């Protein structure tokens, strides 16, 4: 079970759904996990979920667009725990709109949170990891980064860009013993999808050879596998977790 | 010869190597081409290169990050010509540096010029193309988008981003008959590569099964083909022009 | 117009739809084209199509699975024309069936015809192209190779196999200047079942044989001499990469 | 520990390197494993490897090109264990040659073994799998399937064909809960791989060859109930050598 024993992990966007299941699963494998949320109710919910699961772990408030707070989290984690072994980038918003009508700020907010923030966090964690000659960065992207989707040109750009960044990072970090990969969910059962009406939910399932939405745990198990020492020869890749919706 | 007769084309970054070959070639096929450059000399030279090859064609000054200027180019182009059929997005700069040392400004400049500007210009031309129910967007990216390259994490991100965007926009606007595609140059013989010492250039060639650097004209023909009416069933793809350096 | 002036091209499976449009478009651009069919009726229809267009060009009979007949056409083409610059592998049939129900001969027929034939023909034409330090191999595959399709596990394997051979072959013979590429048709109108096909297609329409012919003619030209080991997808947005 | 507890798995080509590591890893996770090799020599060794690890499992002889023997392996397996939850298609050969010199039998051999046999094996295990509405097929391919390689046009075509089959099959059998995936090793240190090594390493960002255990852990992940939403994909295990 404890393949991540004594490792220290940061999961951004860990309050609900996918990020929560990732946080819990990394703690389950022995990792000490800081999950982040955008608000205090979220950070508290992250703590409470660890404790409900009978696991160690913390919630913290983080605006991934605030370089000062990102750098602060890296410093405090290193100070309290002496190490930073795993980064999982799961913070990410949508601001969907037809490209024709899409405003500059609707573009920017998606690019900032989903691409720029991923770069900044990755660069921040890489300094200690490169020095330690160990680490894992796992970026939670999305099938939309590989296949595109009307109304999500901003989201498609940002997530394809994270994959692009990932490959270049892997080539940059070389023999330094850090792997960088993406996990690309398809349509996962969450609050965001549970709230949409039955007709649209079925329209999603039609797209999927397995005939069901995935679970946040599907994503958590894929991330935990990549975070493991036993996945140390995998880097620069995307692990598609989409029920066969997109294949490569 | 004249597959683009009576078409009107904008080629951003048309001043040298690839952008200039693309502009000339589109002109040779009967299109009216407005080539853009960042400065006034750049613009004048684009005129003079058309002038010189015995071709209609216009240089113009454009800062692709300036929305006002971008919209004014579209508006002025519609006013004079009544149509905007082809957009070739070739405006791009590199700000190469290790991710570790990469300044925020180095990341921002590459993302804004190579990704955000591509979205803005694309969005501006969709208005006329949508209403015409026809058009071509060809985005000039780079093998670096698909494969990564040390020193160019920002460039890898942006170019992977353009492809992501291309796929989503193609899905979004395909019912109106506009195709949106990329052409990903490999290592192309330009001023930048002419600059390097033979040992550096030979190190490029070794990654290339055809054993040579490509030309501006290789890209130019690739683009001229996708721009033509005869490529109207090709959408949301990347046409790799890299001598076998990257295959997919 | 004449970007293939004085080139000699063989197009296998050139009798109808996509093969015919390819054969004709190459002839239009100057190439001397031998189109192949499995039967004499096919061969004569290929000759007739060139003549109706006012083009030079020839029909021949070829069983692409007979290795003798394949080396023999390459040789008989060189004898008569003294050159072989372009090969288009468009021969190929389907034998659709669910994998659970699929017979070994339905798997073999598709693999032999779509994959092994492509090896044999490419190997055969490599001799003069390797010797001449130039040439174009354009393999007609299918979106099915990239995306899969239920009832088409044999066809998917064959066509995906052709892409993979292309990439390996492109790396292997690239020094000598020959390009090897694939053109992957999506759903092409040849010869509310049609509404469910269009649903999958951003452009909202089936492609034409001419869409494929123009992509092929492009890759076959000198001006595409830096493009190798790729798949040019011609599928209206049905599959993107 | 036992993510594959009580499951039954066939691993073809299980006598050495990758296949052996996979076979043993599946057994450590609680699977009953039948590992195959062409010769009764490889079969005995497979038995011995399990004994050495103190594990359940056994070796069987199988010409993956023999239609009758393939179907009878599946039959006997269902006969003895009542179930067949996992197939790992690892059996495979190379017959490298420049395409322009390659013989028909060098093409056929690679394609029969690496592509046709993969189809046969998969078609036979789907009968029991589809009746159980559950299963895993994991195909061991290779980076050469994705990036190509001089000398290996037959190998590249076979492996790329397997990836293509996998996508079509995932679409066909997805609704019954079975996943079909590939694992694509890059350069792995085996008795086949072990300045020749130095060259290979410059191609690999991580700076080293992989191990059979790297492949086995990937395979075990995909085989697990926990990877049940992953289908039709290729999991690259290549140190950054090919990135997709």
From TrEMBL, chains A, B:
First and last residue of the signal peptide: none
Location of the active site: 155 (proton acceptor)
Record keywords, A-Z: Fatty acid biosynthesis, Fatty acid metabolism, Lipid biosynthesis, Lipid metabolism, NADP, Oxidoreductase
Cross-referenced CDD domains: BKR_SDR_c (cd05333)
The keyword Signal is assigned to this record: no
Annotated function: Catalyzes the NADPH-dependent reduction of beta-ketoacyl-ACP substrates to beta-hydroxyacyl-ACP products, the first reductive step in the elongation cycle of fatty acid biosynthesis.
SUPFAM superfamilies (UniProt xref): NAD(P)-binding Rossmann-fold domains
Molecular-function annotations in GO: 3-oxoacyl-[acyl-carrier-protein] reductase (NADPH) activity; NAD binding
Binding site for NADP(+): 13-16, 38, 63-64, 90, 155-159, 188
Enzyme Commission number(s): 1.1.1.100
Catalyzed reaction equations: a (3R)-hydroxyacyl-[ACP] + NADP(+) = a 3-oxoacyl-[ACP] + NADPH + H(+)
Domain Ketoreductase: 7-191
Name listed for the protein in its UniProt record: 3-oxoacyl-[acyl-carrier-protein] reductase
UniProt family annotation: Belongs to the short-chain dehydrogenases/reductases (SDR) family.
Biological process, per Gene Ontology: fatty acid elongation
Functional pathway: Lipid metabolism; fatty acid biosynthesis
């Amino acid at each position: 079970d404890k393949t991540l024993d004594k490792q220290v992990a940061i999961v951004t966007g860990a309050s609900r759904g996918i990020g929560r299941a990732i946080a819990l699963e990394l703690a389950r494998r022995g990792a000490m996990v800081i999950g982040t949320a955008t608000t205090e109710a979220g950070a508290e919910g992250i703590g409470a979920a660890f404790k409900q699961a009978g696991l160690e772990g913390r919630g913290a408030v983080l605006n991934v667009n605030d370089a000062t707070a990102v750098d602060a989290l890296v410093e405090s984690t290193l100070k309290e725990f002496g190490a930073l072994n795993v980064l999982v980038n799961n913070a990410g918003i949508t601001q969907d709109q037809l490209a024709m009508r899409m405003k500059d700020d609707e573009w920017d907010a998606v690019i900032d949170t989903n691409l720029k923030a991923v770069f900044r966090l990755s660069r921040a964690v890489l300094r200690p990891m490169m020095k330690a000659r160990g680490g894992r960065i796992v970026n939670i992207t999305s099938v939309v980064g590989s296949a595109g989707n009307p109304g999500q040109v901003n989201y498609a750009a940002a997530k394809a860009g994270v994959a692009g960044m990932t490959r270049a990072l892997a080539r940059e970090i070389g023999s330094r013993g850090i792997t960088v990969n993406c996990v690309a969910p398809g349509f996962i059962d969450t609050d965001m999808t549970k709230g949409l009406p039955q007709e649209q939910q079925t329209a999603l399932k039609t797209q999927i050879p397995l005939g069901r939405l995935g679970s946040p745990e599907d994503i958590a198990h894929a991330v935990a596998f990549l975070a493991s020492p036993q996945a140390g020869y995998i880097t620069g890749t995307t692990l598609h977790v989409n029920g066969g919706m997109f294949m490569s």
